[PDB]
Design a protein around this ligand. Structure first.
Ligand SMILES: COCC(=O)Nc1cccc(NC(C)=O)c1
Ligand SMILES: COCC(=O)Nc1cccc(NC(C)=O)c1
Lengths: 156, 39
C-alpha cells in the first residue's frame, strides 16, 4: 500500500456513501490514530492491509504495523499548529497557543478549536514539524465549543 | 471496512491562520478514556 510519511484520512463505506470517521499519522512505516476512530479494526491502503499492533482505550490511541513512534512533547510555552484534515476539505494548518487540562495525575496541553468529529486524529505540530500529539479527545464547553487534549503516546 | 487516503505532508506553515484561546480547565479522565469537566 501507501507507506510514505504524512497525514491520512480514515474512511468507511458502512454508513451513507464514503464517510470520513477520522485522521491519522504515518511515520516510520507505522500508522497512528485515536482508538475511538477505528475501535481497533484493521485498515486498508489500496491493495495492502494494516493490522493493529498496540492500543489503549484510556489513552484513546492505537498504532498499526508497529509500535507507537511519536515521542515529541509540547514545551508548555510556545504556539503549535493543528494540521486539521476536515471531512471533504483540504488539509489546513491552524496556529494556536494551547491551554491546559489540569488532572489529578498531572497537566496536559489542550487546543481550543472547533472542528467536526471526523477531524479526530489530526496531528498537532511544534515549530520543527514534529508531531506532539493528536487532536480529538476532549470536552465540549458551555456554549458548545470544543477543547481537545494534546494526546501523545510513549515510544518504547 | 475502513481505508486510508493520503492528505498531506506534516510541516509547519508560516502563513497559517492563527486563532483560538488557551483555557485552563480542571478535568477528570475515566477508565473509558472520556474526559469530563470538574468544578
Ligand atoms: C463544518 O464544520 C464546522 C464545525 O464542525 N463546527 C463546530 C465544531 C465544534 C463545535 C462547534 N460549536 C459551535 C457552538 O459552533 C462548531
Ligand atoms: C471527537 O471529537 C469531536 C470533535 O472533534 N468535535 C465536536 C465535538 C462536539 C460537537 C461538535 N459539533 C459540531 C457542530 O460538529 C464537534
Amino acid at each position: 500500500g501507501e507507506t510514505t510519511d504524512g497525514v491520512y484520512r480514515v474512511m468507511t463505506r458502512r454508513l451513507l456513501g464514503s464517510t470520513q470517521v477520522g485522521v491519522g499519522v504515518m511515520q516510520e512505516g507505522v500508522f497512528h490514530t485515536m482508538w475511538h476512530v477505528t475501535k481497533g479494526a484493521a485498515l486498508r491502503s489500496g491493495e495492502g492491509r494494516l493490522d493493529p499492533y498496540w492500543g489503549d482505550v484510556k489513552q484513546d490511541l492505537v498504532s498499526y504495523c508497529g509500535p507507537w513512534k511519536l515521542d515529541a512533547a509540547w514545551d508548555g510555552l510556545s504556539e503549535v499548529q493543528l494540521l486539521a484534515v476536515p471531512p471533504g476539505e483540504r488539509a489546513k494548518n491552524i496556529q494556536t497557543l494551547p491551554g491546559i487540562f489540569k488532572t489529578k495525575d498531572g497537566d496536559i496541553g489542550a487546543v481550543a478549536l472547533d472542528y467536526p468529529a471526523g477531524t479526530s486524529g489530526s496531528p498537532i505540530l511544534d515549530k520543527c514539524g514534529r508531531v506532539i500529539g493528536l487532536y480529538g479527545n476532549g470536552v465540549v464547553i458551555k456554549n458548545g465549543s470544543y477543547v481537545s487534549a494534546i494526546t501523545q503516546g510513549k515510544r518504547e | 471496512d475502513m481505508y486510508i487516503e493520503r492528505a498531506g505532508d506534516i510541516t509547519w506553515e508560516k502563513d497559517a491562520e492563527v486563532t483560538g484561546n488557551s483555557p485552563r480547565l480542571d478535568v477528570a479522565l475515566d477508565e473509558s478514556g472520556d474526559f469530563s469537566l470538574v468544578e
